[PDB]
């Protein structure tokens, strides 16, 4: 557990990465968010030289090769830019009785620190695809639903935050939808 094997550090880089692009982390990461090139891309250099990793080493061409270990992150294919992936704005309300009026589910989205739903439509799989204005609000709103949706007229309901990503991606992903 205490050697010179880089195998240990490899796993460590993850933590940094995973936290950097956290809802509260990025939104509060001027260094990254403020350095962001034109498409929210971060100059590969500004980051590749982050103190956290600066302790790791000074390998420019290598760092990005590891970053690929962050599925929720998208690094430039050329290895010169990169933008963090943090969307997920649509909320999915499942187990909603086909006889459940839009009125009932309408308030189940109701948020206390977020504005009213932007769009609420019935999507197959008894799952209602409600679209919020912004992820920061949606995701945060979902945190409130867990308390409200937890029950409806005494009817316990389950829901999951809908994340957006590549469609033609690999299905190898254990998690299914």
Curated annotation (Swiss-Prot):
Segments of this protein annotated with the region Interaction with the poly-A tract of mRNA: 1-177
Annotated ranges, domain RRM: 93-171
Transmembrane portions of the chain: none
Boundaries of every HTH La-type RNA-binding domain copy: 3-92
GO annotation (BP), single: translation
A GO molecular function held by the record: RNA binding
The keyword Phosphoprotein is annotated on this UniProt entry: yes
Record flagged with keyword Phosphoprotein: yes
UniProt entry keywords in alphabetical sequence: Acetylation, Cytoplasm, Methylation, Phosphoprotein, Protein biosynthesis, RNA-binding
Chief location bin: cytoplasm
GO cellular component, one term: cytosol
Subcellular locations according to the entry: Cytoplasm, Stress granule; Cytoplasm, Cytosol
Protein function: RNA binding protein that binds to the poly-A tract of mRNA molecules. Associates with the 40S ribosomal subunit and with polysomes. Plays a role in the regulation of mRNA translation. Plays a role in the regulation of cell morphology and cytoskeletal organization.
Subunit structure: Interacts (via N-terminal region) with PABPC1. Interacts with RACK1.
Listed name of the protein: La-related protein 4
Segment of the intact protein contained: 111 to 287 of 724
């Amino acid at each position: 557990n205490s050697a010179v094997s880089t195998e240990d550090l490899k796993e460590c880089l993850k933590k940094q990465l995973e936290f950097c692009f956290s809802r509260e982390n990025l939104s509060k990461d001027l260094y990254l968010i403020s350095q962001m090139d034109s498409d929210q891309f971060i100059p590969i250099w500004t980051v590749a030289n982050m103190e956290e990793i600066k302790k790791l080493t000074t390998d420019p061409d290598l760092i990005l090769e590891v970053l690929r270990s962050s599925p929720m992150v998208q690094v430039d294919e050329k290895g010169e830019k990169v933008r963090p992936s943090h969307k997920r704005c649509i909320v999915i309300l499942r187990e909603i009785p086909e006889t459940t009026p839009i009125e009932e589910v309408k308030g189940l989205f109701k948020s206390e620190n977020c504005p009213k739903v932007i769009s609420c439509e019935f999507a197959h799989n008894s799952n209602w695809y409600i679209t919020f204005q912004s992820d920061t609000d949606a995701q945060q709103a979902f945190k409130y639903l867990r308390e409200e949706v937890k029950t409806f007229q005494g009817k316990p309901i389950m829901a999951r935050i809908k994340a957006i990503n590549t469609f033609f991606a690999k299905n190898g992903y254990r998690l299914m939808d």
